[PDB]
């Protein structure tokens, strides 16, 4: 029976009272079976009406199985504990992790269901299994062990993690390990086969010391602020369009001289035209790949990510903290069965992992979707144990990239 | 009875203490009444007389079809801990699972039958008056903050043993009510109910007897629940001089009646109160509204009924366009009998958009009510849906849908082109407007410049110059502009709008054989 680390909210703060979302019957039976086993194992206990707190609960489909997972939305409790509870016991974010050629991601959350949770903090993990059509008051529970998805869980467990990881970290001094929520981020400059063996040694080393792992390869060497460019080809339409995006560009980088190429007609001309302007575009293209300076990350400011529907199973994204200030740019793609919604889900889960490695925080998302549609189907493909903030966009200007 | 149930422990908000409100003796004949009640209450354990052991106090009252006690607990309520929410919503008759027999057992003396936590009783003290007799509460006081939630918890526990032994029977818990259904013979069912009564009796909970069991139709939360069908209680809407208040009450009744009465349309009547206005401020009756209400009285002239839910049968929703941005839907399991109905609205947008929005409203409701999404039979074809979204900027997804040909079908009234054409023109169209005083043009023929106007907005002018580009336009054509405003509007491929000028541009775009637009800085 380990000694329970006490947890205090930033004084002047109450506990979460988020309302539970309505769920489908398939998912409620799932949560009822999960929750029943969890109550036999002692991990959760039913509670009374004198607990006012609530946080939302969802069900997801884990990696790929029938096996249903329970997913708790501690976004509210995180903002009211981990803020100054991380400052108390925080995980330092390792800067080199962005540099390594491969980064794999180990789920280590099941381990938390061992360390007991401090008795005076339990009431704030109240959650509710809903019923259908208001037939019954929901089923109510709180946690007695560290819940998955509470950012205070890794903070408390980090001492146990460091002890089990002490030997692996010396025999392997070159490897960067980062813990974020229920995930263990491992980066090495090894070859893919070599990297995969080292990971398999790590999982094995972790398994045998108790820490149950499941038993996602990222390549941040290939990530940068990708520059806006255009492949070579020029009609008037092509000229005018190319003329356009250069104007939007003068913003993210004052230096373009579109007027040099602008020399054109001034009658029907949607046909073809021969291109000095060739020289002007050549110099600009050099300035285009120039890394925009003046781009600084402030930890006080939050991270905002925006996504745009390109088409044909591909999506483009931009992460900033201030107007322009484009700290990262990139692309997402898929083969198949992807729909407008499901791809976005996978996109977001790729745009979050990237900000976690780079800056150790998740970004608050602006999303290209009707709110209610998102709220209905996001869990149908969600497979991360975390949940980013998100708001819904309405008016898509032709940013032209 | 006081009840052998355990008590929910109560605390006071951290660092607070009991209310010390004093009473103003008011009537003294009422004091003779209040002594009568409080003597009975001490006679059944509900309240007990207390000494002057430095207790707190709360007001009293006597308000009485012609009395009745009413302690004001507002001051205690403000210092008592917070409890779990009670029941935000109400179960929908469409969601109710069909049952052979149903029974409405109304518990009696609900709150007074559940003991209150000992260590918190001191704080419920109320004095009765030229000295004053003292009293505290032993059971859940009426109007106390934690009475509703602690009764609900207590009733949920008292039922667990009997449910255990009776997995077949289904009991709904609402407020001070139990709705109790089974699939067994009446004689069997009347026996099971009578067992429920005795179970509840042992715990301190009185119930109606067989002669006093409410009989159907049940008039409940504004419905008529019949044995195998349900409907709304008779909606009643009257003169000529109306108020904001009268308009609001009316739109309430037609939204209300629209869950089973299909085709209700309340748009016209709604826009009338669209401004802050007042409540008594009389409002004029628009003629199109007097039509809506005339149509509405026709829907409500005859009755219609919903059926109850069968989770074995499958769920089918249908949508049919009404016009004017209004849509109407019906969920059923068999084609005649609707589980329920409803309608959608929008606040300038293409039909497929507003259609896929309606499917959203239905999915949300289907999950709230049946825990399942409804299979859909819509008046549209893949060709129409697939292309709209695939070139829609926004993400969208629609569950299983089969085509039904019930005009008005929704379709793409027009469509822009993706690449330029085999030669038409330019139409570079500008809208110069002096924000100080009240443009238009094309350089294909160069026959630019049609007409300015007073109070004409540069945004209206640029969009009108694109419509002006449509003037010299013939068949396959290509326009251009430096106004981002214009581009977003026609690109959204809207099929109706408030400014008919933009509706004219749709008529132009609908008429022209192949269009392709572009923007330049
Ligand atoms: C409702 N009915 C006649 C059916 O035939 C549909 C089957 O309704 C029930 C199913 C199980 C338990 C109880 C059921 O009955 C009810 C469910 C919910 C609210 C009710 C409110 C009143 C009143 N006042 C009466 C009965 C109610």
Curated annotation (Swiss-Prot), chain A:
Effect of residue 386 to L: No effect on RT p66/p51 heterodimerization
Record note on what altering residue 186 to A does: 37% increase of DNA-directed DNA polymerase activity. No loss of RNA-directed DNA polymerase activity
Motif stretch (Tryptophan repeat motif): 374-390
Effect of residue 183 to A: Strongly decreased RNA-directed and DNA-directed DNA polymerase activities. Loss of pyrophosphorolysis (reverse of the polymerase reaction). No effect on RNase H activity
Substitution effect: residue 52 to G: 64% loss of polymerase activity. 57% loss of RNase H activity
Residues binding Mg(2+) 1, per UniProt: 107, 182-183
Effect of residue 182 to E: Strongly decreased RNA-directed and DNA-directed DNA polymerase activities. No effect on RNase H activity
Effect of residue 49 to G: 74% loss of polymerase activity. 86% loss of RNase H activity
Effect seen on changing residue 62 to R: 10-fold decreased sensitivity to ddATP and ddCTP inhibitors
Effect of residue 180 to A: Almost complete loss of polymerase activity
Protein name: p51 RT
Source domain of life: Viruses
Outcome of mutating residue 150 to F: 10% loss of DNA-directed DNA polymerase activity. 22% loss of RNA-directed DNA polymerase activity
Effect annotated for changing residue 217 to A: Complete loss of RNA-dependent DNA polymerase activity. Complete loss of RNA 5'-end and 3'-end cleavages
Documented effect of changing residue 374 to L: No effect on RT p66/p51 heterodimerization
Cysteines engaged in disulfide bonds, as pairs: none
Outcome (variant: residue 216 to A): Complete loss of RNA-dependent DNA polymerase activity. Complete loss of RNA 5'-end and 3'-end cleavages
Effect of residue 153 to T: Complete loss of polymerase activity. No loss of RNase H activity
Reported impact of residue 62 to E: Strong decrease in RT binding affinity for all dNTP substrates and in catalytic efficiency. 100-fold decreased sensitivity to ddNTP inhibitors
Domain Reverse transcriptase stretches: 41-218
Essential for RT p66/p51 heterodimerization, annotated site positions: 377, 390
Effect of residue 246 to S: 17% loss of polymerase activity. 30% loss of RNase H activity
Effect annotated for changing residue 169 to R: In strain: Isolate PV22
Curated annotation (Swiss-Prot), chain B:
Locations listed in the record: Virion
Record's catalysed reaction(s): Endohydrolysis of RNA in RNA/DNA hybrids. Three different cleavage modes: 1. sequence-specific internal cleavage of RNA. Human immunodeficiency virus type 1 and Moloney murine leukemia virus enzymes prefer to cleave the RNA strand one nucleotide away from the RNA-DNA junction. 2. RNA 5'-end directed cleavage 13-19 nucleotides from the RNA end. 3. DNA 3'-end directed cleavage 15-20 nucleotides away from the primer terminus; DNA(n) + a 2'-deoxyribonucleoside 5'-triphosphate = DNA(n+1) + diphosphate
Motif Tryptophan repeat motif per UniProt: ranges: 385-401
Phenotype for residue 221 to A: No effect on RNA-dependent DNA polymerase activity. No effect on RNA 5'-end and 3'-end cleavages
Positions of region (RT 'primer grip'): 218-226
Phenotype upon changing residue 427 to L: No effect on cleavage between p51 RT and p15
Residue numbers marked as site, Cleavage: 427-428
Outcome (variant: residue 256 to T): Complete loss of polymerase activity. 87% loss of RNase H activity
Effect ascribed to mutating residue 176 to N: Strongly decreased RNA-directed and DNA-directed DNA polymerase activities. No effect on RNase H activity
Residue numbers binding Mg(2+) 1: 106, 176-177
Effect of residue 148 to G: 34% loss of polymerase activity. No loss of RNase H activity
Gene: gag-pol
All copies of domain RNase H type-1, residue ranges: 421-521
Annotated consequence of substituting residue 175 to L: 90% loss of polymerase activity. No loss of RNase H activity
Result of changing residue 223 to A: Complete loss of RNA-dependent DNA polymerase activity. Complete loss of RNA 5'-end and 3'-end cleavages
Residue ranges of domain Reverse transcriptase in the record: 44-225
Effect ascribed to mutating residue 177 to A: Strongly decreased RNA-directed and DNA-directed DNA polymerase activities. Loss of pyrophosphorolysis (reverse of the polymerase reaction). No effect on RNase H activity
Outcome when changing residue 427 to I: Loss of cleavage between p51 RT and p15
Effect of residue 443 to L: In strain: Isolate PV22
Comment text on domains: RT is structured in five subdomains: finger, palm, thumb, connection and RNase H. Within the palm subdomain, the 'primer grip' region is thought to be involved in the positioning of the primer terminus for accommodating the incoming nucleotide. The RNase H domain stabilizes the association of RT with primer-template. The tryptophan repeat motif is involved in RT p66/p51 dimerization.
Effect of residue 485 to E: Almost complete loss of RNAase H activity
The protein's assembly and partners: Heterodimer of p66 RT and p51 RT (RT p66/p51). Heterodimerization of RT is essential for DNA polymerase activity. The overall folding of the subdomains is similar in p66 RT and p51 RT but the spatial arrangements of the subdomains are dramatically different.
Protein name: Reverse transcriptase/ribonuclease H
Effect of substituting residue 52 to G: 74% loss of polymerase activity. 86% loss of RNase H activity
């Amino acid at each position: 029976p380990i000694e329970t680390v006490p947890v205090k909210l930033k004084p002047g703060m109450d506990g979460p009272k988020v309302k539970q979302w309505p769920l489908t019957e398939e998912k409620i039976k799932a949560l009822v079976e999960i929750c029943t086993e969890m109550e036999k194992e002692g991990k959760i206990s039913k509670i009374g009406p004198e607990n006012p707190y609530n946080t939302p609960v969802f069900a997801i489909k884990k990696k790929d199985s029938t096996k249903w997972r329970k997913l708790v939305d501690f976004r509210e409790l995180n903002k009211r504990t981990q803020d100054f509870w991380e400052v108390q016991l925080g995980i330092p974010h390792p800067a080199g992790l962005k540099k390594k050629k491969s980064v794999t991601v180990l789920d280590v959350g099941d381990a938390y269901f061992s360390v007991p949770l401090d008795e005076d903090f339990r009431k704030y993990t109240a959650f509710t299994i809903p019923s259908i059509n208001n037939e019954t008051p929901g089923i109510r529970y709180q946690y007695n062990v560290l819940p998955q998805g509470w950012k205070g869980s890794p903070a408390i467990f980090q001492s146990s993690m460091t002890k089990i990881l002490e030997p692996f970290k010396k025999q392997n001094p070159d490897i960067v390990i980062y813990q974020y929520m229920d995930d263990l981020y491992v980066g090495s400059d090894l070859e893919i086969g070599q990297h995969r063996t080292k990971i398999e040694e790590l999982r094995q080393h972790l398994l045998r010391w108790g820490l149950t792992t499941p038993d996602y390869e990222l390549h941040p060497d290939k990530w940068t602020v990708q520059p806006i460019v255009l492949p070579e080809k020029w009609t008037v339409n092509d000229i005018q369009k190319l003329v356009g995006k250069l104007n939007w560009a003068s913003q993210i980088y004052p230096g373009i001289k579109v007027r040099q190429l602008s020399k054109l007609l001034r009658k029907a001309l949607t046909e073809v035209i021969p291109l000095e302007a060739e020289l002007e575009l050549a110099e600009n293209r050099e300035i285009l790949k120039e890394p925009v300076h003046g781009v600084y990350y402030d930890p006080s400011k939050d991270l905002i990510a925006e996504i745009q529907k390109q088409g044909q199973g591909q999506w483009t994204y931009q992460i900033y903290q201030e107007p322009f200030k484009n700290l990262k740019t990139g692309k997402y793609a898929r083969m198949a069965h992807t729909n407008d919604v499901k791809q976005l889900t996978e996109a977001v889960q790729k745009i979050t992992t990237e900000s976690i490695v780079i800056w150790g925080k998740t970004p608050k998302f602006k999303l290209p979707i009707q709110k209610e549609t998102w709220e209905t189907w996001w869990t149908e493909y969600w497979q991360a144990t975390w949940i980013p903030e998100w708001e819904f966009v309405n008016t898509p200007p032709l940013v032209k990239l | 009875p006081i009840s052998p149930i355990e008590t929910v422990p109560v605390k006071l908000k951290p660092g607070m203490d009991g209310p010390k409100v004093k009473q103003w003796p008011l009537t003294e004949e009422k004091i003779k009444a209040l002594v009568e009640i409080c003597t009975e209450m001490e006679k059944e354990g509900k309240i007990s007389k207390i000494g002057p052991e430095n207790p707190y106090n709360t007001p009293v009252f006597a308000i009485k079809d012609s009395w009745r006690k009413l302690v004001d607990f507002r001051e205690l309520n403000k210092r008592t801990q917070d409890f779990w929410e009670v029941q935000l919503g109400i179960p929908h008759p469409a969601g109710l699972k069909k049952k052979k027999s149903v029974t409405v057992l109304d518990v009696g003396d609900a709150y007074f039958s559940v003991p209150l936590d000992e260590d918190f009783r001191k704080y419920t003290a109320f004095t009765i008056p030229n000295p004053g007799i003292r009293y505290q509460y032993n059971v859940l006081p009426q109007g106390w903050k934690g009475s509703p939630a602690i009764f609900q918890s207590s009733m949920t526990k008292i039922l667990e043993p009997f449910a255990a032994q009776n997995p077949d029977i289904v009991i709904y818990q609402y407020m001070d009510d139990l709705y109790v259904g089974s699939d067994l013979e009446i004689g069997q069912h009347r026996t099971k109910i009578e067992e429920l009564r005795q179970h509840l009796l042992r715990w301190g909970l009185t119930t109606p007897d067989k002669k006093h069991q409410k009989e159907p139709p049940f008039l409940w939360m504004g419905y008529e629940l019949h044995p195998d069908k349900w409907t709304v209680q008779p909606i009643v809407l009257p003169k000529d001089s109306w108020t904001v208040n009268d308009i609001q009450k009316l739109v309430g009744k037609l939204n209300w009646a629209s869950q089973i009465y299909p085709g209700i349309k309340v748009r016209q009547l709604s826009k009338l109160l669209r401004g802050t206005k007042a409540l008594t401020e009389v409002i004029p009756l628009t003629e199109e509204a007097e039509l809506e209400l005339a149509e509405n009285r026709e829907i409500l002239k005859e009755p219609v009924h919903g059926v109850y839910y069968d989770p074995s049968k499958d769920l089918i929703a249908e949508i049919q366009k009404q016009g004017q941005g209004q849509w109407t839907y019906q969920i059923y399991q068999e084609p005649f009998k609707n589980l329920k109905t409803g309608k959608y609205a929008r606040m300038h947008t293409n039909d497929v958009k507003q259609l896929t929005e309606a499917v959203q409203k239905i999915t949300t409701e289907s999950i709230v009510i049946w825990g399942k999404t409804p299979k859909f039979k819509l008046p549209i074809q893949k060709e129409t849906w697939e292309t709209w979204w695939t070139e829609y900027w926004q993400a969208t997804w629609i569950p299983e849908w089969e085509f039904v040909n019930t005009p008005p079908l929704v379709k793409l009234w027009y469509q822009l082109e993706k690449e330029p054409i085999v030669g038409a023109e330019t139409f570079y169209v500008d809208g110069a407007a002096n924000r100080e005083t009240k443009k238009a043009g094309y350089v294909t023929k160069g026959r630019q410049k049609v007409v300015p106007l007073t109070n004409t907005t540069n945004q209206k002018t640029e969009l009108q110059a694109i419509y002006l580009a449509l003037q010299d336009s013939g068949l396959e054509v290509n326009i251009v502009t430096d106004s981002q405003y214009a581009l977003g509007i026609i690109q959204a491929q809207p099929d109706k709008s408030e400014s008919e000028l933009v509706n004219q541009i749709i008529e132009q775009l609908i008429k022209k054989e192949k269009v392709y637009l572009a923007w330049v800085p």
